[PDB]
Amino acid sequence: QDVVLGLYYMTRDCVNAKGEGMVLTGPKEAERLYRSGLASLHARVKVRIT
Amino acid sequence: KPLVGTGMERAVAVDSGVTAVAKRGGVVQYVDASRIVIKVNEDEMYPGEAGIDIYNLTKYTRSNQNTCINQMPCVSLGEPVERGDVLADGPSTDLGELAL
Amino acid sequence: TEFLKPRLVDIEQVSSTHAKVTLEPLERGFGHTLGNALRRILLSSMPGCAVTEVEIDGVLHEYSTKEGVQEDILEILLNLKGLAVRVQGKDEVILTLNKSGIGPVTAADITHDGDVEIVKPQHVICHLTDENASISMRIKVQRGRGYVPASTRIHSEEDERPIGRLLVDACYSPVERIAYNVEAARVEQRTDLDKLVIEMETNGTIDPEEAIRRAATILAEQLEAFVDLR
Amino acid sequence: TEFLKPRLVDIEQVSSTHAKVTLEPLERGFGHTLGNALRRILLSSMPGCAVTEVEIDGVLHEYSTKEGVQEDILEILLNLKGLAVRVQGKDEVILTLNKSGIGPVTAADITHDGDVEIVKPQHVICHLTDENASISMRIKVQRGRGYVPASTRIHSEEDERPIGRLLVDACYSPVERIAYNVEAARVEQRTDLDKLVIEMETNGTIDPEEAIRRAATILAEQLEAFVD
Amino acid sequence: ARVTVQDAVEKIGNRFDLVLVAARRARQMQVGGKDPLVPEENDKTTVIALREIEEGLINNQILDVRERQEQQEQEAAEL
Amino acid sequence: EIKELLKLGDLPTSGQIRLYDGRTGEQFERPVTVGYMYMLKLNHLVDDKM
Amino acid sequence: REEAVVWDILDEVIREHPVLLNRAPTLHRLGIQAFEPVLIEGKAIQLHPLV
C-alpha cells in the first residue's frame, strides 16, 4: 500500500509543473535537479536513457 | 480531558461511583490527599446530629486487572460545594468528566 | 573567491523565554542548510540542569501520602520535574526546601545558594492545608544533556541507596521549541544575499547567544572528522 | 562536551569517480544532520568549470539542424554539457573546434592550450555523415559554483546576443550524484548510536574523496565565526 | 552462496540433495576438524560448505574415495 | 461550524497546513492534515505478551 | 547477570543461524518462513513489510 502509493505519486505528469521541456543527459542529473528543488517531480522532460 | 467529547462523560463519571460525590452541599473545611471534610450548610442540618460529613479517599489499590485506583481531591480549602457535586477525581476522571 | 561569511548581528529578546537571533549575510541555499543543522543540534544536544533525585522526610516511596499536603507525592515529583535551575560553578548541587504553614509552596521557598539561580520563583511545587503541617525536602540536581530515564542511572551506579532516595526522570535539555525562516538580506551591491532568523523558545538557564555558539562549536567539532580525515 | 568522535572506517572506490565512504560511530541524530549538510554543500556551492555558451555557424536556434551531422544539435548541447574541464591558470576560456572527415568527433580534436585539461578526450560529441561536411564552432567555458540552468540565464543577460548563440545548463559542481543513508551503530553499551554511509558520483577532474574534504573545509570555514 | 543457493543446484542436480550433501560435509568439517578447501573469510560452518559446493570442489562420487584411502592406509599402518 | 471555529482561532479553513521534514528540512509537496486526536492506551501491553 | 560478554557472544551466535516465524492460523505453506535474525533493543518482533 505505501510503496505503490509512492511510486504512483512520483510516476505522474502535470501540464505546467516546473522545468518542463528541459533536456537532461541522464537520470543522475535528474535526481540532482529534483533534490536541488529546481525541477518538480512530475515534469515532462527529455532524458537520455541507456 | 477529551477536547472533542459527547457530553455524557459528566454522567458516566458520577454514575460509575469511582468519584467522591458530595451527598449534602456545604463549604469545604479541610482537605488532604486522603481526607475531605465539609461543614454542611444550616439548611441541611438535621436538628439531632452534628451535620459534618467525612469523605475518606481510597489511595493506590490493586484492581482486578492489576491497575492502580486512587482518588485525588479536585477541590481546595474553603470553597463552596453543592449537593451531588464531585469532590475527588476517580482513576480516569478529570474534574468529574470521564477521561479514558 | 566570491564567498561571504555569516555574522551574528542582532539578538532580539522577546521575553525571558522567547528569543530572536538574526544571522546574515547568507548565500544561496545556505540559509536552510545552516538553519536545519542548527535546529537539529539545538533540540538534541544542549546541556542543562534538571532535578534528578528528591528526598523527603517521613516518606518511604512515591506511592504514599503525607498529612496536610493537598496533592500526592507523584504530583510533587512531577512538579519538581519542571524546575528551571541554573548552576554556575559546579555540576552537582544539593538543594534544601523547608516550609511550614498553610498556603501554596513555590520555588522561592528553596534556601537559595550563591551558585544556584532559580528562573521561576513563582512556580508552585506543593500545597499545605494544615498549619501544623511541615515539609522538609532535599533536592539533588546534576547537569547533563539529552533525556535520561530512571533505568540508566540505577543500572550505571552500583552503590546501594537508602530507602527514601526517590529517583525522578531527568529532562536535561532546556530547549523547548525552535524555528527558523529565511528572508532577503539588504546589500547595496548584492541584492541576492539571504538573512537567517532563528526563533528560540526555552526556559531560562540558557542564553540564546551562548546556545547558538555551543551548537556551532559542536557542529565544527563533528566536521573535524571530515576536514582532514578523508 | 563528552561527544564521541567517529573513526573513518574505509573508502570503497569502484572507479575513479564512484566512491562510498562509511562513518562510524555517530551520536544519535548526527548522521542525518551531517548527511544533509554535506549533500546541500555538494549540490549548491562546489566551484567548478563548465560550458555555458556555444556559438555554431549555420544554425539559427535550437530547432535548427546542421546538414551533414547524423545527430541533431540538442544532442550536441547535451554532449557539451557532459564535459569535465579543468582550468588552472586563468578563469575565462574560449575554445574553438574544427573537424572534418568520416567518423565520430571527440573532445580530443578541440584546440587546446596548456592551462586547459580534459579528463576524457575520447568523449564523443557527434558523428559525421560525409567528409565533405565540416564542423566548426566556438564554445564558452566559465568558472563558477553550483548549478545554473539556461532558463534563469536568458533574462540575466539582457544584451541582445547575435542570433545563433545557444545556452547550455552550467554544471559547475563536479558532483554527478550524492546520496546518504543512516543505519544503526553498534556499541555494546550504546545501542542508540547510528552510522553514516555516503555514496558519491563525480565527473573527472576531482578525486571523489577530495570533494568530501572540500565540503568539510568550506562548512568549517563558514562556521568559524562562532567557534570562539 | 550466502543469501541464495541458485548455482549450487546445477553442480548438484537437485535441491533436496544439496541439504544432505552440505550437512554431510559440515559434519566432519566441524567435528572432524579438517581444513575446508574453500577459504574462511569469517563465515559459519554451515555456509562454508554451501560456498564450497557453489564453487563445486566436492562431489558425491569423489566424496567416497578420500575416506577409503585413509582407512586403507590406516590398516596398512596397523599391519 | 468547524470552519467558523477554525476561522475564529486564526486557522486554515481547509484544515491542513504545510509541514517541514525534521530530517532534511524542506516543505512537503502537499498540505498535510494535522490536528489533535484523542488516543487511548489499551490493556494489550507488550511486556505482558513477551 | 547479563554481562557484556554474553552479548559479545550472542551477536556471533545468532549470525547465519536462521529462525522460523509463524503466524497462526497458517492457512498455506507461506505461513512458515525462515529469517536471518538481527538483534534489536526492544520487545517486539520486527517484520519485513514485503512478507
Swiss-Prot record, chain B:
Superkingdom: Bacteria
Leader sequence residues: none
Application of this enzyme or protein: Co-administration of salinamide and rifampicin or salinamide and myxopyronin suppresses the emergence of resistance to both antibiotics.
Post-translational modification (record): Acetylated on several lysine residues in the presence of glucose.
SUBUNIT field: The RNAP catalytic core consists of 2 alpha, 1 beta, 1 beta' and 1 omega subunit. When a sigma factor is associated with the core the holoenzyme is formed, which can initiate transcription. The rRNA transcription and antitermination complex (rrnTAC) consists of RNAP, NusA, NusB, NusE (rpsJ), NusG, SubB, ribosomal protein S4, DNA and precursor rRNA; S4 is more flexible than other subunits. In pull-down experiments interacts with CedA.
Family: Belongs to the RNA polymerase beta chain family.
Stated role: DNA-dependent RNA polymerase (RNAP) catalyzes the transcription of DNA into RNA using the four ribonucleoside triphosphates as substrates. Resistance to the antibiotics salinamide A, salinamide B, rifampicin, streptolydigin, CBR703, myxopyronin, and lipiarmycin can result from mutations in this protein.
Protein known as: DNA-directed RNA polymerase subunit beta
Organism, scientific name: Escherichia coli (strain K12)
Swiss-Prot record, chain D:
Residue ranges of the region described as Required for interaction with Crp at class II promoters: 157-160
Major enzyme class: transferase
Enzyme nomenclature, EC number: 2.7.7.6
GO cellular component entries: cytoplasm; cytosol; cytosolic DNA-directed RNA polymerase complex; membrane; transcription elongation factor complex
Reaction catalysis annotation: RNA(n) + a ribonucleoside 5'-triphosphate = RNA(n+1) + diphosphate
Family affiliation: Belongs to the RNA polymerase alpha chain family.
Protein name, per record: DNA-directed RNA polymerase subunit alpha
Native organism: Escherichia coli (strain K12)
Upper classification of the organism: Bacteria, Pseudomonadati, Pseudomonadota, Gammaproteobacteria, Enterobacterales
Covered residues, full protein: 6 to 233 of 329
From Swiss-Prot, chain E:
Enzyme Commission no: 2.7.7.6
Domain of life assignment: Bacteria
Gene3D superfamilies listed in its UniProt record: 3.90.940.10
Entry's Gene Ontology molecular function annotations: bacterial-type RNA polymerase core enzyme binding; DNA binding; DNA-directed RNA polymerase activity
Any GO BP: response to heat
Any Pfam family matching the protein: RNA_pol_Rpb6
Alphabetical UniProt keywords: DNA-directed RNA polymerase, Nucleotidyltransferase, Transcription, Transferase
Catalyzed reaction equations: RNA(n) + a ribonucleoside 5'-triphosphate = RNA(n+1) + diphosphate
Cellular-component GO terms for this entry: cytosol; cytosolic DNA-directed RNA polymerase complex; RNA polymerase complex; transcription elongation factor complex
Record note on quaternary structure: The RNAP catalytic core consists of 2 alpha, 1 beta, 1 beta' and 1 omega subunit. When a sigma factor is associated with the core the holoenzyme is formed, which can initiate transcription. The rRNA transcription and antitermination complex (rrnTAC) consists of RNAP, NusA, NusB, NusE (rpsJ), NusG, SubB, ribosomal protein S4, DNA and precursor rRNA; S4 is more flexible than other subunits.
PANTHER family, sorted: DNA-DIRECTED RNA POLYMERASE SUBUNIT OMEGA
Family the UniProt entry places it in: Belongs to the RNA polymerase subunit omega family.
Designated name of the protein: DNA-directed RNA polymerase subunit omega
Swiss-Prot record, chain G:
Free-text biotechnology note from the record: Co-administration of salinamide and rifampicin or salinamide and myxopyronin suppresses the emergence of resistance to both antibiotics.
Entry comment on modification after translation: Acetylated on several lysine residues in the presence of glucose.
Family membership noted in the UniProt record: Belongs to the RNA polymerase beta' chain family.
General function of this protein: DNA-dependent RNA polymerase (RNAP) catalyzes the transcription of DNA into RNA using the four ribonucleoside triphosphates as substrates.
Subunit structure: The RNAP catalytic core consists of 2 alpha, 1 beta, 1 beta' and 1 omega subunit. When a sigma factor is associated with the core the holoenzyme is formed, which can initiate transcription. The rRNA transcription and antitermination complex (rrnTAC) consists of RNAP, NusA, NusB, NusE (rpsJ), NusG, SubB, ribosomal protein S4, DNA and precursor rRNA; S4 is more flexible than other subunits.
Protein name per UniProt: DNA-directed RNA polymerase subunit beta'
Species for this entry: Escherichia coli (strain K12)
Positions spanned in the full protein: 403 to 453 of 1407
